[PDB]
Short mmCIF file of N, CA and C in Angstrom, two decimals:
data_model
loop_
_atom_site.label_atom_id
_atom_site.label_comp_id
_atom_site.label_asym_id
_atom_site.label_seq_id
_atom_site.Cartn_x
_atom_site.Cartn_y
_atom_site.Cartn_z
N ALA A 1 0.84 -1.23 0.00
CA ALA A 1 0.00 0.00 0.00
C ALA A 1 0.86 1.26 0.00
N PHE A 2 2.02 1.17 0.65
CA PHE A 2 2.94 2.30 0.73
C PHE A 2 4.13 2.10 -0.21
N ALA A 3 3.90 1.36 -1.29
CA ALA A 3 4.95 1.09 -2.26
C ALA A 3 5.23 2.31 -3.13
N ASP A 4 4.19 3.07 -3.43
CA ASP A 4 4.32 4.26 -4.26
C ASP A 4 3.82 5.51 -3.54
N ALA A 5 3.50 5.37 -2.25
CA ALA A 5 3.02 6.49 -1.46
C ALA A 5 4.01 7.64 -1.47
N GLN A 6 3.51 8.85 -1.72
CA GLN A 6 4.36 10.04 -1.75
C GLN A 6 4.99 10.28 -0.39
N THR A 7 5.88 11.26 -0.32
CA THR A 7 6.55 11.59 0.94
C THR A 7 6.93 13.06 1.00
N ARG A 8 6.98 13.60 2.21
CA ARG A 8 7.33 15.00 2.43
C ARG A 8 7.69 15.23 3.89
N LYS A 9 8.46 16.28 4.15
CA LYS A 9 8.88 16.58 5.51
C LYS A 9 7.79 17.34 6.27
N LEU A 10 7.58 16.93 7.52
CA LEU A 10 6.58 17.55 8.37
C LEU A 10 7.12 18.81 9.04
N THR A 11 6.35 19.89 8.97
CA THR A 11 6.75 21.15 9.58
C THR A 11 6.67 21.07 11.10
N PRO A 12 7.46 21.90 11.81
CA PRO A 12 7.46 21.92 13.27
C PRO A 12 6.08 22.26 13.83
N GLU A 13 5.36 23.11 13.11
CA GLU A 13 4.02 23.51 13.53
C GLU A 13 3.06 22.32 13.45
N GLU A 14 3.10 21.61 12.33
CA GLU A 14 2.23 20.45 12.13
C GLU A 14 2.61 19.34 13.10
N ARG A 15 3.90 19.23 13.39
CA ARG A 15 4.39 18.21 14.31
C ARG A 15 3.97 18.52 15.74
N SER A 16 3.87 19.81 16.05
CA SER A 16 3.48 20.25 17.39
C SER A 16 2.00 20.00 17.64
N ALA A 17 1.17 20.38 16.69
CA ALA A 17 -0.27 20.20 16.81
C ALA A 17 -0.62 18.72 16.87
N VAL A 18 -0.03 17.95 15.96
CA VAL A 18 -0.26 16.52 15.92
C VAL A 18 0.11 15.89 17.25
N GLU A 19 1.37 16.08 17.64
CA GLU A 19 1.85 15.55 18.91
C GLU A 19 0.94 16.03 20.05
N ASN A 20 0.35 17.21 19.85
CA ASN A 20 -0.56 17.79 20.83
C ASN A 20 -1.90 17.05 20.79
N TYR A 21 -2.27 16.58 19.60
CA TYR A 21 -3.51 15.85 19.41
C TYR A 21 -3.39 14.42 19.93
N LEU A 22 -2.30 13.75 19.55
CA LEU A 22 -2.06 12.38 19.99
C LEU A 22 -1.87 12.32 21.50
N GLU A 23 -1.13 13.28 22.03
CA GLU A 23 -0.86 13.35 23.46
C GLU A 23 -2.14 13.63 24.23
N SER A 24 -2.87 14.65 23.79
CA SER A 24 -4.13 15.01 24.43
C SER A 24 -5.16 13.92 24.22
N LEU A 25 -4.99 13.16 23.14
CA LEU A 25 -5.90 12.08 22.80
C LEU A 25 -5.95 11.04 23.92
N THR A 26 -4.78 10.56 24.31
CA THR A 26 -4.67 9.57 25.37
C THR A 26 -5.29 10.09 26.67
N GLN A 27 -5.23 11.40 26.86
CA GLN A 27 -5.79 12.02 28.06
C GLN A 27 -7.31 12.02 28.02
N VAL A 28 -7.87 12.18 26.82
CA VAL A 28 -9.31 12.20 26.65
C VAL A 28 -9.86 10.78 26.51
N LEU A 29 -10.43 10.27 27.59
CA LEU A 29 -11.00 8.92 27.59
C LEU A 29 -12.34 8.90 28.32
N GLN A 30 -13.35 8.35 27.66
CA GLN A 30 -14.69 8.26 28.24
C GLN A 30 -15.41 7.01 27.76
N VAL A 31 -16.56 6.72 28.38
CA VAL A 31 -17.37 5.56 28.02
C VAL A 31 -16.50 4.32 27.78
N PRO A 32 -16.26 3.52 28.83
CA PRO A 32 -15.44 2.30 28.74
C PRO A 32 -15.87 1.41 27.58
N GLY A 33 -17.11 0.95 27.63
CA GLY A 33 -17.62 0.09 26.58
C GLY A 33 -16.88 -1.23 26.49
N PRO A 34 -16.90 -2.04 27.56
CA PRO A 34 -16.21 -3.34 27.59
C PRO A 34 -16.88 -4.37 26.68
N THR A 35 -16.07 -5.20 26.03
CA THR A 35 -16.59 -6.23 25.14
C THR A 35 -15.83 -7.54 25.32
N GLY A 36 -15.52 -7.87 26.57
CA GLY A 36 -14.80 -9.10 26.85
C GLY A 36 -13.36 -8.85 27.24
N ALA A 37 -12.43 -9.20 26.36
CA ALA A 37 -11.01 -9.02 26.62
C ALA A 37 -10.33 -8.30 25.46
N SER A 38 -9.19 -7.67 25.74
CA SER A 38 -8.45 -6.95 24.72
C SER A 38 -9.28 -5.81 24.13
N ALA A 39 -9.32 -4.69 24.84
CA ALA A 39 -10.09 -3.53 24.39
C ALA A 39 -9.47 -2.23 24.90
N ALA A 40 -8.14 -2.17 24.88
CA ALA A 40 -7.43 -0.98 25.35
C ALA A 40 -7.33 0.06 24.24
N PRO A 41 -7.08 1.33 24.61
CA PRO A 41 -6.96 2.43 23.64
C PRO A 41 -5.93 2.12 22.56
N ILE A 42 -5.63 3.12 21.73
CA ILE A 42 -4.66 2.95 20.66
C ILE A 42 -3.90 4.25 20.40
N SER A 43 -2.82 4.46 21.15
CA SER A 43 -2.01 5.65 21.00
C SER A 43 -0.65 5.30 20.39
N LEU A 44 -0.27 6.03 19.36
CA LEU A 44 1.01 5.78 18.68
C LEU A 44 2.12 6.66 19.26
N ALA A 45 3.32 6.10 19.36
CA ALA A 45 4.47 6.82 19.88
C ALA A 45 5.26 7.46 18.74
N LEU A 46 5.57 8.74 18.88
CA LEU A 46 6.30 9.46 17.84
C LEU A 46 7.72 8.93 17.67
N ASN A 47 8.05 8.59 16.43
CA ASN A 47 9.38 8.08 16.09
C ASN A 47 10.05 9.00 15.08
N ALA A 48 11.26 8.63 14.66
CA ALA A 48 11.99 9.44 13.69
C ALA A 48 11.19 9.64 12.41
N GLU A 49 10.35 8.65 12.08
CA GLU A 49 9.52 8.74 10.89
C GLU A 49 8.42 9.78 11.10
N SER A 50 8.14 10.08 12.37
CA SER A 50 7.12 11.07 12.72
C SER A 50 7.32 12.38 11.97
N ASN A 51 8.50 12.57 11.39
CA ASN A 51 8.80 13.78 10.64
C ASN A 51 8.46 13.59 9.17
N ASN A 52 8.78 12.41 8.64
CA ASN A 52 8.52 12.11 7.24
C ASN A 52 7.06 11.71 7.02
N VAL A 53 6.28 12.61 6.42
CA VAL A 53 4.87 12.34 6.15
C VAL A 53 4.69 11.52 4.88
N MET A 54 3.82 10.52 4.96
CA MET A 54 3.54 9.65 3.83
C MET A 54 2.17 9.98 3.23
N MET A 55 2.14 10.20 1.92
CA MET A 55 0.90 10.53 1.23
C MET A 55 0.46 9.41 0.30
N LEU A 56 -0.80 9.00 0.41
CA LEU A 56 -1.32 7.93 -0.43
C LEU A 56 -2.83 7.98 -0.55
N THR A 57 -3.34 7.56 -1.71
CA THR A 57 -4.77 7.49 -1.92
C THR A 57 -5.21 6.09 -1.53
N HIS A 58 -5.99 5.98 -0.46
CA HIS A 58 -6.40 4.67 0.02
C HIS A 58 -7.67 4.75 0.86
N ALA A 59 -8.41 3.64 0.89
CA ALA A 59 -9.64 3.56 1.67
C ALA A 59 -9.33 3.22 3.12
N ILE A 60 -9.79 4.06 4.04
CA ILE A 60 -9.54 3.84 5.46
C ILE A 60 -10.62 2.98 6.09
N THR A 61 -10.20 1.95 6.81
CA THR A 61 -11.13 1.05 7.49
C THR A 61 -11.39 1.55 8.90
N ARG A 62 -12.55 1.23 9.44
CA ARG A 62 -12.91 1.67 10.79
C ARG A 62 -13.20 0.50 11.71
N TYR A 63 -12.28 0.22 12.62
CA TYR A 63 -12.45 -0.87 13.57
C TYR A 63 -12.67 -0.31 14.98
N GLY A 64 -13.93 -0.23 15.39
CA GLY A 64 -14.26 0.29 16.70
C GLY A 64 -13.99 -0.70 17.82
N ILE A 65 -13.69 -0.18 19.00
CA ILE A 65 -13.42 -1.01 20.16
C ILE A 65 -13.64 -0.24 21.46
N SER A 66 -13.18 1.00 21.48
CA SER A 66 -13.32 1.85 22.66
C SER A 66 -14.79 2.04 23.04
N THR A 67 -15.66 2.00 22.04
CA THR A 67 -17.09 2.18 22.27
C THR A 67 -17.91 1.71 21.07
N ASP A 68 -19.21 1.55 21.27
CA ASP A 68 -20.10 1.11 20.20
C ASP A 68 -20.83 2.29 19.57
N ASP A 69 -20.30 3.49 19.77
CA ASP A 69 -20.90 4.70 19.21
C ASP A 69 -19.84 5.53 18.49
N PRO A 70 -20.18 6.10 17.31
CA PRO A 70 -19.25 6.92 16.52
C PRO A 70 -18.29 7.74 17.38
N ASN A 71 -17.18 7.12 17.74
CA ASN A 71 -16.18 7.78 18.57
C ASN A 71 -14.78 7.20 18.34
N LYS A 72 -13.84 7.59 19.20
CA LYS A 72 -12.46 7.14 19.11
C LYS A 72 -12.37 5.64 18.83
N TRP A 73 -11.86 5.31 17.65
CA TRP A 73 -11.71 3.92 17.22
C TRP A 73 -10.41 3.74 16.44
N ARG A 74 -10.14 2.50 16.05
CA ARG A 74 -8.93 2.18 15.30
C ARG A 74 -9.23 2.11 13.81
N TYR A 75 -8.34 2.67 12.99
CA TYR A 75 -8.54 2.65 11.56
C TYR A 75 -7.50 1.77 10.90
N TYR A 76 -7.73 1.39 9.65
CA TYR A 76 -6.79 0.52 8.96
C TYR A 76 -6.58 0.92 7.51
N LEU A 77 -5.32 1.14 7.16
CA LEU A 77 -4.94 1.50 5.80
C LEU A 77 -4.48 0.24 5.08
N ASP A 78 -5.34 -0.31 4.23
CA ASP A 78 -5.00 -1.52 3.51
C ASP A 78 -4.89 -2.68 4.51
N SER A 79 -3.74 -3.37 4.54
CA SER A 79 -3.54 -4.47 5.47
C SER A 79 -2.78 -4.00 6.71
N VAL A 80 -2.74 -2.69 6.92
CA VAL A 80 -2.03 -2.12 8.07
C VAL A 80 -2.96 -1.30 8.96
N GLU A 81 -2.60 -1.18 10.23
CA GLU A 81 -3.39 -0.41 11.18
C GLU A 81 -2.93 1.04 11.21
N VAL A 82 -3.89 1.97 11.19
CA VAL A 82 -3.56 3.39 11.21
C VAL A 82 -4.48 4.18 12.14
N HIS A 83 -4.04 5.39 12.47
CA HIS A 83 -4.78 6.27 13.36
C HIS A 83 -5.43 7.42 12.59
N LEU A 84 -6.74 7.30 12.36
CA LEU A 84 -7.50 8.32 11.66
C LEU A 84 -8.40 9.06 12.64
N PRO A 85 -8.15 10.37 12.88
CA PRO A 85 -8.94 11.16 13.82
C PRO A 85 -10.44 11.02 13.59
N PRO A 86 -11.22 10.90 14.68
CA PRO A 86 -12.68 10.74 14.62
C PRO A 86 -13.42 11.80 13.79
N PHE A 87 -12.73 12.87 13.39
CA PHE A 87 -13.39 13.92 12.61
C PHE A 87 -13.33 13.66 11.10
N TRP A 88 -12.61 12.63 10.68
CA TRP A 88 -12.50 12.32 9.26
C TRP A 88 -13.35 11.11 8.88
N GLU A 89 -13.95 10.46 9.88
CA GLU A 89 -14.80 9.30 9.63
C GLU A 89 -15.84 9.62 8.56
N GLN A 90 -16.24 10.88 8.50
CA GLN A 90 -17.22 11.33 7.52
C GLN A 90 -16.53 11.82 6.26
N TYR A 91 -15.29 12.29 6.41
CA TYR A 91 -14.51 12.79 5.28
C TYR A 91 -13.85 11.65 4.51
N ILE A 92 -13.96 10.43 5.04
CA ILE A 92 -13.35 9.27 4.40
C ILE A 92 -14.33 8.55 3.47
N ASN A 93 -14.06 8.62 2.17
CA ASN A 93 -14.89 7.96 1.17
C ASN A 93 -14.20 6.69 0.67
N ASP A 94 -14.72 6.11 -0.42
CA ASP A 94 -14.13 4.90 -0.99
C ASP A 94 -12.62 5.05 -1.13
N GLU A 95 -12.20 6.09 -1.84
CA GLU A 95 -10.78 6.37 -2.03
C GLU A 95 -10.50 7.78 -1.53
N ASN A 96 -9.52 7.92 -0.64
CA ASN A 96 -9.21 9.23 -0.08
C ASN A 96 -7.73 9.50 0.00
N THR A 97 -7.39 10.78 -0.07
CA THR A 97 -6.01 11.21 0.05
C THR A 97 -5.63 11.21 1.52
N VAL A 98 -4.84 10.22 1.91
CA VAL A 98 -4.44 10.08 3.31
C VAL A 98 -2.96 10.34 3.53
N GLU A 99 -2.67 11.37 4.31
CA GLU A 99 -1.30 11.71 4.64
C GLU A 99 -1.03 11.32 6.08
N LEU A 100 -0.13 10.36 6.28
CA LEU A 100 0.17 9.88 7.62
C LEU A 100 1.65 9.65 7.84
N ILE A 101 2.07 9.76 9.09
CA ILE A 101 3.46 9.53 9.48
C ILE A 101 3.54 8.26 10.30
N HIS A 102 4.53 7.42 10.04
CA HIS A 102 4.67 6.16 10.75
C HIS A 102 5.33 6.35 12.11
N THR A 103 4.58 6.05 13.16
CA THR A 103 5.08 6.19 14.53
C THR A 103 5.76 4.90 14.97
N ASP A 104 5.91 4.73 16.29
CA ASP A 104 6.54 3.53 16.83
C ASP A 104 5.58 2.34 16.74
N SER A 105 4.32 2.63 16.46
CA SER A 105 3.30 1.60 16.34
C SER A 105 2.68 1.61 14.95
N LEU A 106 1.79 2.58 14.72
CA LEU A 106 1.12 2.72 13.44
C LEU A 106 1.25 4.15 12.92
N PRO A 107 0.90 4.38 11.65
CA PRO A 107 0.99 5.70 11.04
C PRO A 107 -0.17 6.61 11.42
N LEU A 108 0.18 7.79 11.93
CA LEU A 108 -0.82 8.78 12.32
C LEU A 108 -1.19 9.64 11.11
N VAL A 109 -2.46 9.61 10.74
CA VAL A 109 -2.93 10.39 9.61
C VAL A 109 -3.05 11.86 9.99
N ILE A 110 -2.06 12.64 9.58
CA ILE A 110 -2.02 14.07 9.89
C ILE A 110 -2.96 14.88 9.01
N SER A 111 -3.25 14.37 7.82
CA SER A 111 -4.14 15.08 6.90
C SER A 111 -5.00 14.11 6.09
N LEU A 112 -6.06 14.65 5.49
CA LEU A 112 -6.97 13.86 4.68
C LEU A 112 -7.53 14.70 3.55
N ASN A 113 -8.03 14.05 2.51
CA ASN A 113 -8.59 14.75 1.36
C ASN A 113 -9.49 15.92 1.77
N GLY A 114 -8.94 17.13 1.72
CA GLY A 114 -9.72 18.32 2.06
C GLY A 114 -9.90 18.55 3.55
N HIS A 115 -8.99 18.03 4.36
CA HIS A 115 -9.07 18.21 5.81
C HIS A 115 -7.71 18.04 6.46
N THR A 116 -7.57 18.55 7.67
CA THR A 116 -6.31 18.45 8.40
C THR A 116 -6.54 18.27 9.89
N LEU A 117 -5.55 17.71 10.57
CA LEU A 117 -5.63 17.47 12.00
C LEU A 117 -5.69 18.78 12.78
N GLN A 118 -4.97 19.78 12.29
CA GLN A 118 -4.95 21.08 12.94
C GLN A 118 -5.27 22.18 11.94
N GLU A 119 -6.55 22.28 11.59
CA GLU A 119 -7.01 23.29 10.64
C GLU A 119 -7.45 24.56 11.36
#
């Protein structure tokens, strides 16, 4: 999926807001919504790649777990797991322009077709 994905350097401003979003994200937790076992949050750790943004047109999958209501959930880019902010769930169509940086876990989608994490 990331064989031909574009690439670009992330600005300090975009890196600050994002890191601010991911960091504040873990802090914002509500409605447990237990479903048996294995249902913990999903926060990615910023790595050296956190600077190199990856751009690709791909359909984002939505795998909910934190709750059974349109909220903080796990997304998937192709056969990989990704972090798509809850505000793009509606901005995500069949094929979308997804710009994400690969963290220590999964790639954080900093931007989307006609939208951004810190607009």
